Amino acid sequence: GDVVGVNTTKYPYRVCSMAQGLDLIRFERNIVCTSMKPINEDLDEGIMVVYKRNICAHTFKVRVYQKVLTFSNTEYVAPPMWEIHHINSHSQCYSSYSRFVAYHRDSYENKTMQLMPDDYSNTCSTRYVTVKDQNLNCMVTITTARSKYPYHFFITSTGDVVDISPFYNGTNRNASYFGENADKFFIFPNYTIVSDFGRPNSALETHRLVAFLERADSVISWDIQDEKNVTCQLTFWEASERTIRSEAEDSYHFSSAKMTATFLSKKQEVNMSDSALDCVRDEAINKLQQIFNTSYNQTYEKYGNVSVFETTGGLVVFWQGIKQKSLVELERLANESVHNLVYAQLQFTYDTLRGYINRALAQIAEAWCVDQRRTLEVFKELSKINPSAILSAIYNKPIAARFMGDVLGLASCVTINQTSVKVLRDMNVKESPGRCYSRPVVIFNFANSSYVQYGQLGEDNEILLGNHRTEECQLPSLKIFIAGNSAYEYVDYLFKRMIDLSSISTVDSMIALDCDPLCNTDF
Amino acid sequence: GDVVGVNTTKYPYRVCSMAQGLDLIRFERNIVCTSMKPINEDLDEGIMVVYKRNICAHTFKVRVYQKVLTFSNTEYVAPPMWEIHHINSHSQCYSSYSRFVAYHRDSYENKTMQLMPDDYSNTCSTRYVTVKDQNLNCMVTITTARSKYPYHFFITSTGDVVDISPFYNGTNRNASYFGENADKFFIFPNYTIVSDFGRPNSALETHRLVAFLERADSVISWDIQDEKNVTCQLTFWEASERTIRSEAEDSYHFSSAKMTATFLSKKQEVNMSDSALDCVRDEAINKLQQIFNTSYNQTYEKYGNVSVFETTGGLVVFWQGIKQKSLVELERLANESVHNLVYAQLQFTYDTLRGYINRALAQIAEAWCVDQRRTLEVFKELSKINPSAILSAIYNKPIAARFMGDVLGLASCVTINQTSVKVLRDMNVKESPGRCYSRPVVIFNFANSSYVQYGQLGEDNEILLGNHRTEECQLPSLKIFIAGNSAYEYVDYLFKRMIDLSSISTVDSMIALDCDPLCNTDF
Amino acid sequence: GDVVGVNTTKYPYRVCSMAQGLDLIRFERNIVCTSMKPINEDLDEGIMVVYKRNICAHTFKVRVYQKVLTFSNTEYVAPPMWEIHHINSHSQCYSSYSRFVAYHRDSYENKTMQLMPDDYSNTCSTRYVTVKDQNLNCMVTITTARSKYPYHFFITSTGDVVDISPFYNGTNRNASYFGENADKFFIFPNYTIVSDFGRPNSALETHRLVAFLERADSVISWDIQDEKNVTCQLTFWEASERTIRSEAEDSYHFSSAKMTATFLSKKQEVNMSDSALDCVRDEAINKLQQIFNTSYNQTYEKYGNVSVFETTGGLVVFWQGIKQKSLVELERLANESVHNLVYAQLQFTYDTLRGYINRALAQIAEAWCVDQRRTLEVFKELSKINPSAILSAIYNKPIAARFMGDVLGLASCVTINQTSVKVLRDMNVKESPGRCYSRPVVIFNFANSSYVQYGQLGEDNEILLGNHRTEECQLPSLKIFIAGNSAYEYVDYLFKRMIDLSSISTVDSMIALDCDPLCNTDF
Ligand SMILES: *[C@@H]1O[C@H](CO)[C@@H](O[C@@H]2O[C@H](CO)[C@@H](O[C@@H]3O[C@H](CO)[C@@H](O)[C@H](O)[C@@H]3O)[C@H](O)[C@H]2NC(C)=O)[C@H](O)[C@H]1NC(C)=O
Ligand SMILES: *[C@@H]1O[C@H](CO)[C@@H](O[C@@H]2O[C@H](CO)[C@@H](O[C@@H]3O[C@H](CO)[C@@H](O)[C@H](O)[C@@H]3O)[C@H](O)[C@H]2NC(C)=O)[C@H](O)[C@H]1NC(C)=O
Ligand SMILES: *[C@@H]1O[C@H](CO)[C@@H](O[C@@H]2O[C@H](CO)[C@@H](O[C@@H]3O[C@H](CO)[C@@H](O)[C@H](O)[C@@H]3O)[C@H](O)[C@H]2NC(C)=O)[C@H](O)[C@H]1NC(C)=O
Ligand SMILES: *[C@@H]1O[C@H](CO)[C@@H](O[C@@H]2O[C@H](CO)[C@@H](O)[C@H](O)[C@H]2NC(C)=O)[C@H](O)[C@H]1NC(C)=O
Ligand SMILES: *[C@@H]1O[C@H](CO)[C@@H](O[C@@H]2O[C@H](CO)[C@@H](O)[C@H](O)[C@H]2NC(C)=O)[C@H](O)[C@H]1NC(C)=O
Ligand SMILES: *[C@@H]1O[C@H](CO)[C@@H](O[C@@H]2O[C@H](CO)[C@@H](O)[C@H](O)[C@H]2NC(C)=O)[C@H](O)[C@H]1NC(C)=O
Ligand SMILES: *[C@@H]1O[C@H](CO)[C@@H](O[C@@H]2O[C@H](CO)[C@@H](O)[C@H](O)[C@H]2NC(C)=O)[C@H](O)[C@H]1NC(C)=O
Ligand SMILES: *[C@@H]1O[C@H](CO)[C@@H](O[C@@H]2O[C@H](CO)[C@@H](O)[C@H](O)[C@H]2NC(C)=O)[C@H](O)[C@H]1NC(C)=O
Ligand SMILES: *[C@@H]1O[C@H](CO)[C@@H](O[C@@H]2O[C@H](CO)[C@@H](O)[C@H](O)[C@H]2NC(C)=O)[C@H](O)[C@H]1NC(C)=O
Ligand SMILES: *[C@@H]1O[C@H](CO)[C@@H](O)[C@H](O)[C@H]1NC(C)=O
Ligand SMILES: *[C@@H]1O[C@H](CO)[C@@H](O)[C@H](O)[C@H]1NC(C)=O
Ligand SMILES: *[C@@H]1O[C@H](CO)[C@@H](O)[C@H](O)[C@H]1NC(C)=O
Ligand SMILES: *[C@@H]1O[C@H](CO)[C@@H](O)[C@H](O)[C@H]1NC(C)=O
Ligand SMILES: *[C@@H]1O[C@H](CO)[C@@H](O)[C@H](O)[C@H]1NC(C)=O
Ligand SMILES: *[C@@H]1O[C@H](CO)[C@@H](O)[C@H](O)[C@H]1NC(C)=O
Ligand SMILES: *[C@@H]1O[C@H](CO)[C@@H](O)[C@H](O)[C@H]1NC(C)=O
Ligand SMILES: *[C@@H]1O[C@H](CO)[C@@H](O)[C@H](O)[C@H]1NC(C)=O
Ligand SMILES: *[C@@H]1O[C@H](CO)[C@@H](O)[C@H](O)[C@H]1NC(C)=O
Ligand SMILES: *[C@@H]1O[C@H](CO)[C@@H](O)[C@H](O)[C@H]1NC(C)=O
Ligand SMILES: *[C@@H]1O[C@H](CO)[C@@H](O)[C@H](O)[C@H]1NC(C)=O
Numbered sequence A, B, C: 001g002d003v004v005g006v007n008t009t010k011y012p013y014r015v016c017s018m019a020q021g022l023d024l025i026r027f028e029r030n031i032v033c034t035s036m037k038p039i040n041e042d043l044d045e046g047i048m049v050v051y052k053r054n055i056c057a058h059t060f061k062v063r064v065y066q067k068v069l070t071f072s073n074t075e076y077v078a079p080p081m082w083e084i085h086h087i088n089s090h091s092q093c094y095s096s097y098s099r100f101v102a103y104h105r106d107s108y109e110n111k112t113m114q115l116m117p118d119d120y121s122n123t124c125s126t127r128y129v130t131v132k133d134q135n136l137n138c139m140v141t142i143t144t145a146r147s148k149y150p151y152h153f154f155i156t157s158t159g160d161v162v163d164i165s166p167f168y169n170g171t172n173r174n175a176s177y178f179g180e181n182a183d184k185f186f187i188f189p190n191y192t193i194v195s196d197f198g199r200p201n202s203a204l205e206t207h208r209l210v211a212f213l214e215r216a217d218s219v220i221s222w223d224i225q226d227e228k229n230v231t232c233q234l235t236f237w238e239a240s241e242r243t244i245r246s247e248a249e250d251s252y253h254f255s256s257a258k259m260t261a262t263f264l265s266k267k268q269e270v271n272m273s274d275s276a277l278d279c280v281r282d283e284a285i286n287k288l289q290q291i292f293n294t295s296y297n298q299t300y301e302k303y304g305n306v307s308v309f310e311t312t313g314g315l316v317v318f319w320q321g322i323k324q325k326s327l328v329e330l331e332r333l334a335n336e337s338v339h340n341l342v343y344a345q346l347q348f349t350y351d352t353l354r355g356y357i358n359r360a361l362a363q364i365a366e367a368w369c370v371d372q373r374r375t376l377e378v379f380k381e382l383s384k385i386n387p388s389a390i391l392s393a394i395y396n397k398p399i400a401a402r403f404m405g406d407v408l409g410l411a412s413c414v415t416i417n418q419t420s421v422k423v424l425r426d427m428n429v430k431e432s433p434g435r436c437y438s439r440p441v442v443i444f445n446f447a448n449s450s451y452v453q454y455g456q457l458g459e460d461n462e463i464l465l466g467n468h469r470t471e472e473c474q475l476p477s478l479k480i481f482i483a484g485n486s487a488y489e490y491v492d493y494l495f496k497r498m499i500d501l502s503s504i505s506t507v508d509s510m511i512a513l514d515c516d517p518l519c520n521t522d523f
């Protein structure tokens, strides 16, 4: 018997599977704390923007053309290139394949066929077929592909690896890579492809350079683009409006009151007119200008130009120094030699105490590093037990991860029906007496699908697959498992009742007021 | 064989049992961080007091009248209401029960009997019996009962649930609830009850309205009181003396230097003359006044009246703005137009730099939120392994909790003899070779009791019951277990000796100075 | 089959073994938070140095003289005292032992023999033998010994315990201890010992008082030194240059912006001319003077003398108050009655706002205590799973520890060959089907040794010994284990390939930018 799940928005019912072992991540002791010695108090003030080196892989759309022969053996084969041109120009595919000849079931027509959407396809690998039989079929998949720097090869979402640079345009093999078979690669200038293969009549679109590669079981096509125009090696991390900077003999140390991180760099600057900054220069400059306009246009003035620094940790810093206007000007905006001396003394007092404040703020900012390093070690230790929760806490977004020894694998989640989730009432393992499930078993259905699947209920509405988590049936038992807006009581590994979530208090770490439980009476 | 435990004050030897699954608690991602954008520096200063919504259940005393028939079947039955009046007025009970008639062993007297204390009873369920035989007996238990808002039903410590509002006084069923059998409920104006049932002659006391309900096996009585007079939905959390507040277009943001939490509310205020604030208004007002008198009466002045705000997180804030007296007044307390201008310039400089300081403090206070959120996730992950330790760390008090899947159950601890704790010498499981106990087995005795109980030694002098924790006998073994002021060495799962606690160093996280261990010599 | 490890500097391949259960450590709730109530703003400023009570054991070199009889029974015996004098004066040992008489194999010479280094010996227990046969042999070990306060006994690295004070010089048994057999103890004034026993001719050195004790199987010798001259009960923890101090009615509270810890003491001072401060007085004084010279010689002046305080937590504080020079002097260094009044008003304004800043800084410093206490509880909970990692994070140095119930044992690591580390390809337990290793098995060799040892690969290049960690073979499997600069893929518990470390991203907690994994397609 069953009981029925309840929807939720940010954490939908989903099955998260590991990306074939490819998206690996690991913890490293990369937090280094260096306490600044001098108590020097003439610190500079300014606006700062921080960019991080882009490690994420460039993602681009590819097309995968195949024909399917069934006798359930399901042989996949490459369509001929003329048939590929038919598919790209007319969105139609011919009803035969020849190697000696085969046709759709009980047919000989070699007629043209109109491609139609496969409704079983997803937001990745959107698929089109000529015969909707979800014999011979013709199939076109449009899907993602990822390539990490250096872009000398790319891996498509279907797991095929191609040893060709996604930016090799047939005239730059000296600045790119090509490692696949030469006789099976074809670049086409001004190639015309239809907008949607599933439409009987679609708006044709011309693409500058389209590349094709004849795989063994497939033909893979992708649109060649300009590297410097589509890929940027720096990703904007964060802008700090109130930044202070202390100068050493060969170091600039940047601190921010709102940030728990301090940056350290050499006093030599980066050439701002360098090509590696081309995709972030204007953005960073305008970000600095915006922060000035909205915050310091009236009370401050720009001191120097924009200076680019490279942090010891690898970050890139764009710096705009700011200096507050004199107190005479500030007062005039808010509204004789002896009066000039009075204002000079006021300015000296103000500057001295402001430098004291800035030194104190810099020390406060430096005070966070040891705590951050120790919490990093805490995260590394806890990631062996629940890597998904730890990485979600670190990155402040729902992240699924799996433990792989000394590394973690990132996983991608497929949203399921959300209304087919049926939780089983009996958590006792009937197939093995003495063993009980750790979390309740769920019946669920994938989208646009009807085959009932059996998984196990996880946390945050996640559905688990594979080997079910089991344990010893330690009677008496009383467990409460939450899914959606609902809680399920299991007494002695059998479903008892529903529980209102309002009947369960939430831990408040900020306030931390506790309620006394019911007393016991030596019973 | 045995070895003897040693006392300790804050963590007495105790057995902690879960409150029947009723006192549930869970972790939720309830820490939300919203970084304030503007660097506006005209922040307000003031005193703040913060109250939290009262989630704890209202607790009130009830009386449970029963008679006990033994033939060990121990049938419990409801005493007749006239016998209830005898018990309440004379503290005496009649020696018979009729349904056809029964008496104390080998008796027919139907004599009156004087109630005497049951010394086996505790600080909860204090109990009185007529025959001290720890046959027919007469018994009166006085015990706690809890009711959560809305007070439409209450659960007594003995686990009986009653569907009657603890504040239904027989004339307000429109503003209360009554769901029990009507024929079995009786309210009595000006009911006279004795102070102590165990005293031969006690001081009688009149109670305005006393309610009785005839259960199947019991009669339950409670004193009806005024809701608004006995229940308060707001609990005082904390007062901040140095509070700063930044004003947005539709937000007030409160920060405190001593607090790691910042509050955010709309600029619309709460009506301070609202009935829901009646039980906290005067207290909060006097708290604000006290903080002013002891801290700001001389150097500051009150700016505005007391403003009540409702925080986005549900807290209630009482705010008193304060403004420091002019520097001329401060100097005069510490002790012409051109001199007025000089003092105006001094005041302008002071105000500008003070606003800078306040903005920096607000940013520092906001810097804690991400760290607090990540530590909340750390606590949630660690609470699956040791919920009691994690909740004790969060609430800064000894808390016992049990893991119940996606929730935690709060547990209540019964203090045991404290001198009957005998630790067994052999941690090897004799009943199953190859298995060994994880922690040493303890013989202990409950208070006022003699039946020896067998449990397992826990941490912080806790005694564990139920299924003993076991593991594989991984020889060689060397474990040291601490109870009281003493440490027990177990070598190869057999007790070796005592260990002086002074011979074991304590980890110092603040100082963190380490001592090198004895070197090894490739042996 | 095997695959070959790769070197690393800070974490060399090593085997870490627990120091016989002697170097115990435990977590205790020793962080106490006391929030200061008054908002009083006339805080003192000064330089502070903090020393901690020395808990580490005094370590001193000892010599262990033995003769070895083999018939593999390997009886160890004490050399006669005249032979001990021969060893100490000539670095030579006689070729016989008598109790009736024995000689080197097939010999009768009773000739003198020259001691030569045993190359199998380490940086601890450096060893010298007369016959290099790694029968009768003569052996001299030079090794460490530890004694904790009170120094009434010491334990040598070979584990022998001696009930004699390392500072008993034969004339101070009233201020020391002697508990070993009186007839077997001999102190020798101006004893001459050679610098190196392994050298044919070495530079003789005279030692004031050398003590010998005739053990059953050994003779143990050590050089008696002056306690007060070799042992210091206070260890320097840390110096704070910018320290603020708030005065209560019976308390001084010290805070530092760069520190997350605040200190609290009574206002009564420690006598700086006390003998217990003799080994830290000059150092602390000069440290204070250095901080003044390099930071405050120009802008500040010393206020009062050096005051020594004892913190409630047991720390020792040396305090130098500093007061900034008047603004007139500061301005003159940077470069009538009415002008004196103007400068007095400027100074009053500056002092008022500076006191406000100092009060805010003190509150900020106090804000860390609850977070530190909660993180201490987090560390205590996590140390049961991985004590070495937690203690390494706390002390910021590579520390190996073992779990021992309610305590942790510190362990010492022996560096191995570093080039003999061979990782096995098959992680499946051949001796028991259905069980698999948790981490890959390693073949390794100890230094100067050839017997191949079988251990298990740990983290940070650690080699594990004893019972191998095992688990269920949960196929399919894909694990990646890192050693040196290399990563090993194991698919289905069989070695697959090497993995470039650059292909694995590192978690960045400070920046926290995430890359999306490859999407899934309902497969
Ligand atoms: C079904 O009908 C279609 C046409 O209605 C046939 O397609 C034709 O197939 C031949 C090869 O069998 C193509 O010749 C190829 O031409 C390209 C240049 O365009 C050349 O590079 C190749 O080496 C080869 O010679 C021919 O172009 C193509 N007709 C088109 C594209 O209009 C198909 O063969 C028929 N199949 C069966 C099984 O009857
Ligand atoms: C033992 O002796 C006592 C008196 O010494 C007997 O108590 C009496 O019990 C009867 C019922 O059996 C009570 O009558 C009840 O009166 C109330 C009104 O007061 C009425 O609502 C009930 O319906 C019922 O008529 C009587 O009041 C009570 N006497 C008192 C309270 O003084 C008891 O029955 C004797 N038991 C035996 C087994 O002999
Ligand atoms: C091997 O030859 C050496 C000398 O070449 C012999 O050493 C001698 O041994 C005797 C004891 O057997 C030592 O006498 C002892 O003298 C000390 C005072 O020095 C005294 O306290 C003892 O009670 C004992 O009388 C003698 O000094 C020593 N000769 C030296 C040091 O030059 C050794 O006995 C020979 N062994 C064999 C097995 O032949
Ligand atoms: C193919 O790609 C190369 C770069 O790999 C292109 O060469 C660049 O062309 C632009 C535009 O003329 C120049 O500004 C760059 O300096 C060139 N860089 C290099 C390294 O050659 C080339 O133009 C592309 N070819 C086609 C046909 O699109
Ligand atoms: C920073 O890099 C730019 C180019 O990115 C350099 O500009 C060159 O300057 C020299 C000298 O004036 C000219 O002859 C070149 O034509 C410039 N190149 C370009 C592409 O404009 C600039 O000099 C560099 N700055 C430093 C300090 O090395
Ligand atoms: C029973 O309880 C009701 C409330 O539920 C009492 O009614 C309140 O009585 C006080 C005093 O007269 C008034 O100030 C309140 O306004 C009343 N409130 C309501 C909602 O009625 C009632 O007085 C109680 N009855 C007895 C007999 O004590
Ligand atoms: C806040 O609530 C109080 C009552 O709690 C309101 O007081 C009422 O004010 C009106 C207008 O003066 C009077 O006619 C009523 O008699 C008052 N009621 C009581 C119980 O005194 C007050 O007006 C409310 N304030 C706002 C801004 O709505
Ligand atoms: C043996 O040790 C004692 C201390 O235990 C030494 O006595 C100290 O000697 C110095 C130098 O004369 C004096 O300043 C100390 O006051 C003495 N202290 C005590 C407690 O006696 C003694 O001198 C040592 N003896 C030898 C022979 O070295
Ligand atoms: C602090 O201790 C020193 C000794 O360590 C004390 O100095 C003694 O002072 C008295 C009075 O002047 C002299 O008679 C002694 O000779 C001194 N002893 C030494 C060893 O010099 C000092 O008085 C102590 N201070 C306080 C406040 O008790
Ligand atoms: C592709 O189209 C553009 C625009 O018409 C043209 O300049 C270019 O020459 C075309 N390609 C080739 C290979 O001629
Ligand atoms: C800020 O203002 C300047 C002119 O003062 C302008 O050049 C710049 O583009 C502005 N930046 C913005 C609007 O982001
Ligand atoms: C800043 O840039 C201007 C040109 O825009 C240049 O004249 C000036 O010298 C630069 N600043 C410095 C400090 O050299
Ligand atoms: C999802 O489940 C509902 C309820 O069973 C069903 O009506 C609907 O067709 C399903 N949607 C799919 C399978 O796409
Ligand atoms: C209860 O006692 C009070 C005080 O004597 C009295 O006013 C009230 O009327 C009594 N109850 C009834 C129901 O008469
Ligand atoms: C504070 O002083 C005022 C008078 O200035 C008084 O009304 C108020 O009750 C006092 N608050 C206290 C003592 O808590
Ligand atoms: C504060 O309360 C007084 C009455 O006590 C009232 O006159 C005054 O207007 C209130 N404050 C404001 C800002 O309206
Ligand atoms: C507690 O134990 C002590 C020692 O056995 C015993 O004398 C005492 O009576 C006990 N107290 C009880 C059972 O209340
Ligand atoms: C040890 O040598 C010193 C220095 O020559 C000497 O003063 C002392 O008296 C010697 N020892 C004995 C016991 O004579
Ligand atoms: C600091 O300077 C003073 C003289 O002003 C000197 O006595 C003291 O030793 C110096 N301290 C050092 C150099 O550490
Ligand atoms: C500081 O020490 C000097 C002697 O160096 C002494 O005269 C002075 O009184 C001491 N300070 C105080 C505050 O007593």
Ligand SMILES: *[C@@H]1O[C@H](CO)[C@@H](O)[C@H](O)[C@H]1NC(C)=O
Pocket: C417, C419, C420, C445, C446, C447, C448, C449, C450
């Ligand atoms: C360490 O291993 C290397 C490689 O096997 C070997 O040549 C060398 O002798 C070893 N060193 C020792 C055993 O001290």
